[PDB]
RNA sequence: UGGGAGAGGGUGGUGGAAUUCCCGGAGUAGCGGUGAAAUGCGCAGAUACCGGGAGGAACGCCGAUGGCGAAGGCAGCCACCUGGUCCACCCGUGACGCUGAGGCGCGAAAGCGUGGGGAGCAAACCGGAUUAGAUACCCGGGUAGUCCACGCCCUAAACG
RNA sequence: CCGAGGGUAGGGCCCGUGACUGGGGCGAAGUCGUAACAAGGUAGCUGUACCGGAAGGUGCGGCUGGA
RNA sequence: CGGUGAUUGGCGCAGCCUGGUAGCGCACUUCGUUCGGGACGAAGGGGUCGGAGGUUCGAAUCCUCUAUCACCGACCA
RNA sequence: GAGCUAGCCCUGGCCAGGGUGAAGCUGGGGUGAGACCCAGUGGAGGCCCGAACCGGUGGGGGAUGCAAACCCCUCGGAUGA
RNA sequence: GAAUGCCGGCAUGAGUAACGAUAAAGAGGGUGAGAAUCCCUCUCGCCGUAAGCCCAAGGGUUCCUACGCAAUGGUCGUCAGCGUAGGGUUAGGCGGGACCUAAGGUGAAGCCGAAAGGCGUAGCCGAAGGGCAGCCGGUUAAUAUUCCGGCCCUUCCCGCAGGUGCGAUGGGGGGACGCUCUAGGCUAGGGGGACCGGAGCCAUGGACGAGCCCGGCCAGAAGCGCAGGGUGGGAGGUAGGCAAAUCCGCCUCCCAACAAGCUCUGCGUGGUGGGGAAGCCCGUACGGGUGACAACCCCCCGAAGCCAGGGAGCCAAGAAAAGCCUCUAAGCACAACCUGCGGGAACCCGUACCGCAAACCGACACAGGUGGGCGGGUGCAAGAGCACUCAGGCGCGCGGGAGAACCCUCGCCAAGGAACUCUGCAAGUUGGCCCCGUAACUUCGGGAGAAGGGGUGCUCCCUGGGGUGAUGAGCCCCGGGGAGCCGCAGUGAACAGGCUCUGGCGACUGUUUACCAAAAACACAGCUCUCUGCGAACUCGUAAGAGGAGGUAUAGGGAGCGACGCUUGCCCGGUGCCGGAAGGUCAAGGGGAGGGGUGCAAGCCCCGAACCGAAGCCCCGGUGAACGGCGGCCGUAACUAUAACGGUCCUAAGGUAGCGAAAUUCCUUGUCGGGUAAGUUCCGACCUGCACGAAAAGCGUAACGACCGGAGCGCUGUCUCGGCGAGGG
C-alpha cells in the first residue's frame, strides 16, 4: 500500500513514503520503561571512524524487549503498533496480563487485540516465542537468538525471516535471509512468522534531502578526489581507477573475503 | 570582515586558564618556565 | 422443487516418481557424446552404486477420436469460495424475446516494469565437429526467459 | 457607435521546394549464396523475442495449409 | 628532421638472431568426377630474395649507403 | 592553538507580504460493485515573485584605498541539503 | 665605503598626494587673549524596520560635576569620549549562586598503558534549557522593577488554633516538548469622532465655523464577568513498576460522558494610587511653572503577542533531571506533615556608561563585521519593500573661492539603429495591479508572466455583497453599471521582467577554490559490484575502550556510475579477486646417516646428507557494472567508382548497437545544404572516426541554469561621432 506523489514539483514524481495504515491511533508513545535518551553521536571519543553520518532527524530510543524469557508462560494483549525512528520495522506494544508494558518488534499478520505467549508451550501463531528446539521445521520465524541466553539478534530488519530445515543433535540449521544455512542451538528463542512492512524495499528516497533527514550525509567518490586523500583520487580528467578497486586505506573492495579465517565460529556455518 | 578575535570570558578562562593549565603534564611545564622567567602574569588575565 | 457429470475458475495446503547439487560410505581407468568423432568431464578419485540433506519445475499409469469452458484454454491430491450446463416434475411469472454500431470485460505464447525464485530446459553468446564457406542443422557449455505476486502489453494458422 | 480595408502579433490547414536518407517498382543476360515447392535434403507456416552479409537460424507457444 | 621494422613465386607469410637445404596456403596448368561448372581426387611448374659494394671457400642470411613503405616522436616556451 | 575557518553534538532564536491550489474529505455523476470524471473545501511542496537574513554572477570605481577582499549598479537562495 | 648589512638621527618626493562617504549648510547674540569648528536663538537639509529606543556579548571610568589645552582630535578649538581632582553603580521579588539536568568534562568502583598518562557504570560539574516570588509612578547633575509613594506576593524559623497515620536521595504520575496550516475570545499597537477638556488664532482674497491646533491614559489585590487549558468518580481482584505501598499499571462489572463539577491561567471590571499635551512665561548646558479642579468618553482595524500543554494534517516521529502531587519503607506515632493566623529571619555577586558603534573585533574618532525585542503615520493591491514625515537623533572634526584639460558619478541628443567589439561588455527597452489571450514539446505537473495586447487619474448618479454594531444608523473591507472633466502623459514621483528561436554540457534545489576560477567540477536521489551472521565487516587507538549500533542482509561498510527512456556486445592470454584436503618449490623445528676438535679414556663441544616439515609462489579452473583490450595485407560485381564476396597472416578476442569534422577531426575554413549582401563561428547532412563508443557508461530526453555557443525582434552614446549640462575631485 505504498505512497505515490503527483510531480506537482521534481523530486517528487519519484518520491515514495511509506503506508501508515498498520500504524494504530498510538502516533506519541508511552513512558518510563519506554523512551531513554538517544545519545546522538557520528563518531567515538574524538575523531571520526564511520564518515558521512551526521544531522538527521532527532531520535528517542524505543527500549524493546528482545529477551522475552522473562515472562514464560505470562501471556499479553497487542493493543497498539508504533512507528519506531531506530528501526526499519514496525513495533508493536504489549499489555500484560501481569501488568508490564513492553515493545516486541511487530511482526507480519499481527492485528490489535491479539493474545500472545512466549515459552516452550506457547502454540505456533504469529508472534508466539519458542525455544529452537520446539519449533517445527519449515516454519518461518524471526528475532532469532544466536547464543541461548543472549538476545535476540538475528533477523529483525523490515520484511525479513528466517527458516528452520532440521536438526541435528542439540543444534538446528537455519536459512539465513542471506542463504547462509548456519548451526544454531535449541534452547535459543525466537518469535515466529515475518516481520513484516516488506514494502520498506520499494522507498524511493526521491530527493537528496531525504537522505539528509535520516543522518545521512553525502557520499564523495573516491576518484574525485586527491592522491593524498584517496588512492582512486589525482590523476587529470577522469582517471578510470589506475589499479585494483581499493578503498581509502589500501584494501581492495571487489570480491576480497574479509572473515577472520580461524574463527571459532567456522565450525557451525556451512553455506555463503 | 568578521576578524580572528572574537572575545570571550568563559573561553579564555577556560583554554587558557591556571586550572586547565595545572591539569596537563604540558601546561605544568609552562608555568614551571614562566616562574623562572619571572613573567608577571602566569596566565592571562581575566575577570 | 429435486437430482447429475465435468482438467470450469480463484485461494490455501499437501504427496511421491524423476533431474541437479551438497554430504558420507564403497569403488575403480575411464565417462559423456555421434553417423563417425571431437570439445568437455575424470587418479585433485569422475561415470556407475548405496544412504542422508537442500532446491525448483511438471504431474506417469488412469487417459482417449473422452470431458469442461464463450474463446484463449483447463490434468497429482485435499479443503473452501464460485460460474456455467444437463435431466425429471410439468409447479409460478406471463412475450419479459433475438441480434448488436459504440463502450466495457476477457484474452495462448513471446515481451516490459517492480520484487522473489531459479533443479531441468533454453534464444543470445562461447567452444567442438561438418562444409568451399556454417553466424545453422549435430555435440559440450551457458545468460535472459520458462515459475510466483502485482501492474502493463491485445498479437497469431486466436482454425471448424 | 458600427464600419470596408490597412497595420501589428500569434495559431490551424493545404501546396510547392530542400542537402541527405529510408524503403518501393521497373529495367542488360551482373555479384554472393540455397530459403521455400518432393521428407526441398533441418516438414512447412505463423505471433513474438534475439542474432546473423543475405535469403534466414534458433527459443517459447500455436496450425495441417505434413507424416 | 630524429629513432626502428620489413621489402622474399601472381597474392598473403614462414626460412635470418646459431651462414652451405628457399618451405606453407591460396592461386595457375594437366588429368580424373559431373550432362556441364563449382566443390573434390591425383600429379606438375612457378622465386635476379628492392638494388650497389666487401666479409668470407661461400650471403635470402653478416655489415655500410641510397630507393620507397609502415609506425612512433618532434617537448618547456 | 577549532574565540577565524571546516565538520559534528547540546540548547535556543529567525524567515515581512503576496502567488500556484498536490493529496485527502463533502456533494453530484458513473458502475453490478468499482476504476474513474465534475465542482466545492482543503493548503502539500529540497514550488514561484520578492524584503530582513545568507551570498558573491557581470560591469564600473577602488590600487601607499574607507578597506591586508571594500563601495555603487546588477544578480542568486530565500520552509530548507 | 659598500654585505637590498644592524641600530639611531636627518634629508628627497614637496609645501605635493591626502584631510576618511556629495545627507548642506546660512545668519544673529554670547563667552573668550584668541572663534567657520564652543554655547543659545532663528532659517535650511538628512535618517526615520533608523542614522530612533530597550536587552545580551564585549569594553573597564569612558557616566556626572568643577578647573584646564602642552600632547590625543587628520584644521581650529574656549569643546571632548583628553589632563587634574571630587562625586556617582543601594535588590528576598531584575540576572547569576546556596535548585535541576543535556552535549561535553570530571570521575570513588573497575579496566588499560615503559613513565608522563588513556578509558570508564554510579555520583558531581556543566545553561539564554527546565524551576522561581513585583507592577505603576516620583525623585539625583550622575542610580533605580534597587531609593521613596501606593497596591501585591515568596521562602524559611518559632508559636498557639484546627485536621491527617507522619514519614525518604526509594516507587509512580507530572514536568514532557517536532514541522506546517489554523478556530474562538482577548491584549499590545493604531485610525476616526458631530462628544469632552484646553492656552490661544482669523493672517494674504474668502471663512466665527460640527473652524484650526493639542490631548482625551496607566497600573491595580479579593471578588465578580468573559474566553480558555487540565483532568472522569466508585467497587473488588492483582503475580508487574528490582523492599514495601491504599499510588501507578493490568482485568471485571457499576454510574458520567459531559469539561456538568473541581481546580489553573489569561483579559476586562475592580478598594485606591499615579500621569496628564499643544501654546505661553522664563534664568542656566538642561529643566521649572501655568495652561488643568484637566477631560480622561464613543466607535473602527487589529496582531507573529495572551488564553498554551488549543485544534487539524503530515513524516523525517520530534531531551534529561529537579521543583510539584501521590505512595509506602525503615524510624516515629509526647513526634512529624497539611491548612489558617501572628511575630521574627531573609545572604554572596552584577547593576555607572558605550552597546549596528568615536567606548566591542578590524594597529586609527577605519564607508567593514556583530545576537535578541519595539519600531508610528500617509499613499502606492499587500508588506519590515518604496517616497515623505511623528517621537527621537544627525549635517558624518578642514574650510573659503574659482568654473581649464582630464578622472569619477549622473542627465539629455538630430539622423542611423550593433555598422563598435572577443561577445550588445556596459548602458538603454520592458517593468506593479486588473482583464483578454498564449505555440512547438512534454515525464500531462509544466512550458506560462510564453508570446502579444487593452485598462490604470478625477467629479457626479444608480446599484450588490460582507464584518462590527440588534435585523438600523454610522465605521471598515470588497465589487458592478452609467454619465462626464483635464493633461503630452493617470502603477502621472519612488520601489517593479526585455522577449524569442536554436544548440552543447549537466537531470534537476544545492556545494566548492575565505582572498583572481561557482562551472560541464563536487554532491544528489537512483543503478550495479563486492564485503559483512554479530564480540559482525570497517575506522581511531600499543592497549583498554569506543564508533558501527544500543543497528542485524529490506542492515551496515567499500567502490564506480549519476533522475528518467532504450541499452550496456566479444576477449580471462597477462594482473587483481574467488574456488581447488593432488603435485613442485619453500623457513624455523624435528631428524640423524656421516665427519671433525680435544682428552688416557668415561665424556664434552661442533658441523652435517636423506626424510617429516605451514602460509606464500608455481600449477588447475572461474570471474568484466574487476585492472584492461577489442587487427593487417591482397583481389573480386552487366561504364568508371565502390565492395555485398573471397584468399592469406596474426591475436586471447579482433569495435556489435548507437553516435560521429563532435568539449573528440591534424591535414581542415573536409565537402554539400540553410541563416547572411558577405559566415575559419552556428545549425542540418555525407563518413575519409590522425585519435567516439556502452556504468572512467553510450544515445536521447520535458523541465531546470548569474554555465557556454549561434541567430532574430524591440531599444539604445556600443559605434559613425561626437556635443552640452550637473555635482565630487
Ligand atoms: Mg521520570
Ligand atoms: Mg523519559
Ligand atoms: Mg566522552
Ligand atoms: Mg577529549
Ligand atoms: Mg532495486
Ligand atoms: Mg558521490
Ligand atoms: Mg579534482
Ligand atoms: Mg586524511
Ligand atoms: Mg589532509
Ligand atoms: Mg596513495
Ligand atoms: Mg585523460
Ligand atoms: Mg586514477
Ligand atoms: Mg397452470
Ligand atoms: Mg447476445
Ligand atoms: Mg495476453
Ligand atoms: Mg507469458
Ligand atoms: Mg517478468
Ligand atoms: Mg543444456
Ligand atoms: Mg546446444
Ligand atoms: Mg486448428
Ligand atoms: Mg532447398
Ligand atoms: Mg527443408
Ligand atoms: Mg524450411
Ligand atoms: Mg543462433
Ligand atoms: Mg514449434
Ligand atoms: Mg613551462
Ligand atoms: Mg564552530
Ligand atoms: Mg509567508
Ligand atoms: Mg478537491
Ligand atoms: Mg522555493
Ligand atoms: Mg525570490
Ligand atoms: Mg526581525
Ligand atoms: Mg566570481
Ligand atoms: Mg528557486
Ligand atoms: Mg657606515
Ligand atoms: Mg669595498
Ligand atoms: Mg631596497
Ligand atoms: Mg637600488
Ligand atoms: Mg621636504
Ligand atoms: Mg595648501
Ligand atoms: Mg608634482
Ligand atoms: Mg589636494
Ligand atoms: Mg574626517
Ligand atoms: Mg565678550
Ligand atoms: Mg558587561
Ligand atoms: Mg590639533
Ligand atoms: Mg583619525
Ligand atoms: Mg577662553
Ligand atoms: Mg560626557
Ligand atoms: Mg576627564
Ligand atoms: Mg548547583
Ligand atoms: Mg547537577
Ligand atoms: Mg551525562
Ligand atoms: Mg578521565
Ligand atoms: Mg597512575
Ligand atoms: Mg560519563
Ligand atoms: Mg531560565
Ligand atoms: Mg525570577
Ligand atoms: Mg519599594
Ligand atoms: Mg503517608
Ligand atoms: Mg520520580
Ligand atoms: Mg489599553
Ligand atoms: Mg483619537
Ligand atoms: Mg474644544
Ligand atoms: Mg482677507
Ligand atoms: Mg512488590
Ligand atoms: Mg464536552
Ligand atoms: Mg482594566
Ligand atoms: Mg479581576
Ligand atoms: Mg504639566
Ligand atoms: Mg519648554
Ligand atoms: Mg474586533
Ligand atoms: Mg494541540
Ligand atoms: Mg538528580
Ligand atoms: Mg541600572
Ligand atoms: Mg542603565
Ligand atoms: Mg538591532
Ligand atoms: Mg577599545
Ligand atoms: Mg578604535
Ligand atoms: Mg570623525
Ligand atoms: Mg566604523
Ligand atoms: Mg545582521
Ligand atoms: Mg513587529
Ligand atoms: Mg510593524
Ligand atoms: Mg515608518
Ligand atoms: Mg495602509
Ligand atoms: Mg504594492
Ligand atoms: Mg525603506
Ligand atoms: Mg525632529
Ligand atoms: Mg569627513
Ligand atoms: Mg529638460
Ligand atoms: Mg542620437
Ligand atoms: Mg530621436
Ligand atoms: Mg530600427
Ligand atoms: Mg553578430
Ligand atoms: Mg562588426
Ligand atoms: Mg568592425
Ligand atoms: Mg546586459
Ligand atoms: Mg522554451
Ligand atoms: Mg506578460
Ligand atoms: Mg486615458
Ligand atoms: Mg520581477
Ligand atoms: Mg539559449
Ligand atoms: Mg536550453
Ligand atoms: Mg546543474
Ligand atoms: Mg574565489
Ligand atoms: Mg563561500
Ligand atoms: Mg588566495
Ligand atoms: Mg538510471
Ligand atoms: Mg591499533
Ligand atoms: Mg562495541
Ligand atoms: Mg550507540
Ligand atoms: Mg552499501
Ligand atoms: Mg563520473
Ligand atoms: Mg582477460
Ligand atoms: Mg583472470
Ligand atoms: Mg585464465
Ligand atoms: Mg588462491
Ligand atoms: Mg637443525
Ligand atoms: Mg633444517
Ligand atoms: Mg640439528
Ligand atoms: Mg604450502
Ligand atoms: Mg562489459
Ligand atoms: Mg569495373
Ligand atoms: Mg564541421
Ligand atoms: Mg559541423
Ligand atoms: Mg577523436
Ligand atoms: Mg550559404
Ligand atoms: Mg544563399
Ligand atoms: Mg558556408
Ligand atoms: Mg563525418
Ligand atoms: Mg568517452
Ligand atoms: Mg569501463
Ligand atoms: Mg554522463
Ligand atoms: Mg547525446
Ligand atoms: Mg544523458
Ligand atoms: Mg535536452
Ligand atoms: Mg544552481
Ligand atoms: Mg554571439
Ligand atoms: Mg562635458
Ligand atoms: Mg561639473
Given at each position: 500500500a505504498v505512497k505515490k506523489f503527483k510531480p506537482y514539483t521534481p523530486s517528487r514524481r519519484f518520491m515514495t513514503?511509506?503506508?501508515?495504515?498498520?500504524?494504530?491511533?498510538?502516533?506519541?508513545?508511552?513512558?518510563?520503561?519506554?523512551?531513554?535518551?538517544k545519545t546522538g553521536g557520528r563518531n567515538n571519543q574524538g575523531r571520526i571512524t564511520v564518515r558521512f553520518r551526521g544531522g538527521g532527524h532527532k531520535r528517542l530510543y524505543r527500549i524493546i524487549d528482545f529477551k522475552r524469557?522473562?515472562?514464560?508462560?505470562?501471556?499479553?494483549?497487542?493493543?497498539?503498533?508504533?512507528?519506531?525512528?531506530?528501526?526499519?520495522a514496525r513495533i508493536a506494544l504489549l499489555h500484560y496480563v501481569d501488568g508490564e508494558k513492553r515493545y516486541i518488534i511487530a511482526p507480519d499478520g499481527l492485528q490489535v487485540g491479539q493474545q500472545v505467549v512466549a515459552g516452550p508451550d506457547a502454540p505456533?501463531?504469529?508472534?508466539?516465542?519458542?525455544?529452537?528446539?520446539?519449533?517445527?521445521?519449515?516454519?518461518?520465524?524471526?528475532?532469532?537468538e544466536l547464543e541461548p541466553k543472549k538476545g535476540a539478534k538475528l533477523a529483525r530488519a523490515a520484511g525479513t525471516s528466517a527458516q528452520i530445515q532440521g536438526r541435528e543433535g542439540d543444534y538446528v540449521?537455519?536459512?539465513?535471509?542471506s542463504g547462509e544455512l548456519r548451526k544454531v542451538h535449541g534452547e535459543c528463542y525466537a518469535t515466529v512468522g515475518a516481520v513484516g512492512n516488506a514494502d520498506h524495499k520499494n522507498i524511493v528516497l526521491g530527493k537528496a534531502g531525504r537522505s539528509r533527514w535520516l543522518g545521512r550525509?553525502?557520499?564523495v567518490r573516491g576518484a574525485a578526489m586527491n592522491p593524498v586523500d584517496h588512492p582512486h583520487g589525482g590523476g587529470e580528467g577522469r582517471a578510470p581507477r589506475g589499479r585494483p578497486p581499493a578503498s581509502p586505506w589500501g584494501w581492495q573492495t571487489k570480491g576480497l573475503k574479509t572473515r577472520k579465517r580461524r574463527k571459532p565460529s567456522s565450525r557451525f556455518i556451512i553455506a555463503r | 570582515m568578521k576578524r580572528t578575535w572574537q572575545p570571550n570570558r568563559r573561553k579564555r578562562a577556560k583554554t587558557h586558564g591556571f586550572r586547565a593549565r595545572m591539569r596537563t603534564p604540558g601546561g605544568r611545564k609552562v608555568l614551571k618556565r614562566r616562574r623562572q622567567k619571572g613573567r608577571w602574569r602566569l596566565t592571562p588575565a581575566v575577570r
Open positions: 513514503v511509506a503506508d501508515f495504515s498498520e500504524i494504530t491511533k498510538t502516533e506519541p508513545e508511552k513512558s518510563l520503561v519506554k523512551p531513554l535518551k524469557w522473562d515472562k514464560v508462560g505470562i501471556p499479553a494483549k497487542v493493543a497498539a503498533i508504533e512507528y519506531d525512528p531506530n528501526r526499519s505456533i501463531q504469529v508472534g508466539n516465542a519458542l525455544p529452537l528446539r520446539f519449533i517445527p521445521v519449515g516454519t518461518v520465524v524471526h528475532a532469532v540449521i537455519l536459512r539465513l535471509p550525509r553525502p557520499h | -
